[PDB]
């Protein structure tokens, strides 16, 4: 792609420290500040049911792939301006790889 | 995305007339001139097992999404130069939509 696989273990601790505060990755896990992410890849932005998204996320109609996900994670707000996800971004490529490796695997 | 849904019925006849000659979309369908495509989306180019791909397809490490698929279908050779898929391309956006709608659905 324009993405390479990292440590899913490493990625798993990146999440707790960075995503957990607003997210769940488990099938049957609840939405929180952020929506649960089970089954995110191959699915389009704004479709989890029971979640209240911004007009922003919906309209982007992002199709979430490992690659798409990397750019978003760099600067969500730049990528989807008007998004209410308050995360600054994963400046570091190695960080993101790890993370998407993590997601890739547990959102399944 | 940068892709919109079309007629899966229409798409199904585009395939027979344009893809069929070298492909199968069914789980348990055989590779032919081209590889069977069951489960193509979310999977990377060159991974069907038992298929002999060019050095080209492999190296691109394309992650196949509805979107990726559109660009490829326009001009495979431009997109993955050195690819041995002998198809000229689907110049027409509406044609491709239909097709990916079709694939989207039956490669599942
Ligand atoms: C709260 C402080 C958050 C943190 C930390 C992270 N995210 Fe988030 N995320 C949050 C919100 C409020 C939303 C909804 C956006 C909207 O505008 O409605 C999101 C959304 C996402 C998405 C898109 C959801 C979809 O389209 O289904 C993804 C892929 C996502 N969040 C992932 C994610 C990761 C991996 C995080 C840690 C790096 C992360 N977010 C942090 C809120 C919060
Ligand atoms: C024979 C004349 C073909 C026709 C008509 C179409 N395709 Fe094809 N396809 C063909 C070959 C020989 C290959 C392998 C490429 C290589 O370099 O090894 C392919 C490959 C594809 C792929 C990529 C396969 C993968 O990475 O798993 C896709 C997505 C694909 N073909 C789709 C496709 C469609 C939808 C077609 C009709 C428009 C089509 N191809 C025509 C051979 C032939």
Curated annotation (Swiss-Prot), chains A, B:
Signal peptide: none annotated. Methylation may enhance its transport into mitochondria. Methylation occurs in fungi, plants, and some protozoa, but not in animals. The precise role of methylation at Lys-78 is unknown, but it seems to preclude pro-apoptotic activity, possibly by lowering affinity for APAF1. Induction: By oxygen at the level of transcription. Expression drops rapidly when the oxygen concentration falls below 0.5 uM O(2). Binds 1 heme c group covalently per subunit. It is found in: Mitochondrion intermembrane space. Its cofactor is heme c. GO terms for cellular component: mitochondrial intermembrane space; mitochondrion. One of its GO terms (biological process) is mitochondrial electron transport, cytochrome c to oxygen. InterPro entries: Cyt_c-like_dom, Cyt_c-like_dom_sf, Cyt_c_1A/1B. It comes from the Eukaryota. Disulfide bonds: none annotated. Changing residue 77 to R: Loss of methylation by CTM1. The modification N6,N6,N6-trimethyllysine is found at residues 77-78. Heme c binds at residues 19, 22-23, 85. Pfam families: Cytochrom_C (PF00034). Belongs to the cytochrome c family. This is Cytochrome c isoform 1. The gene is CYC1.
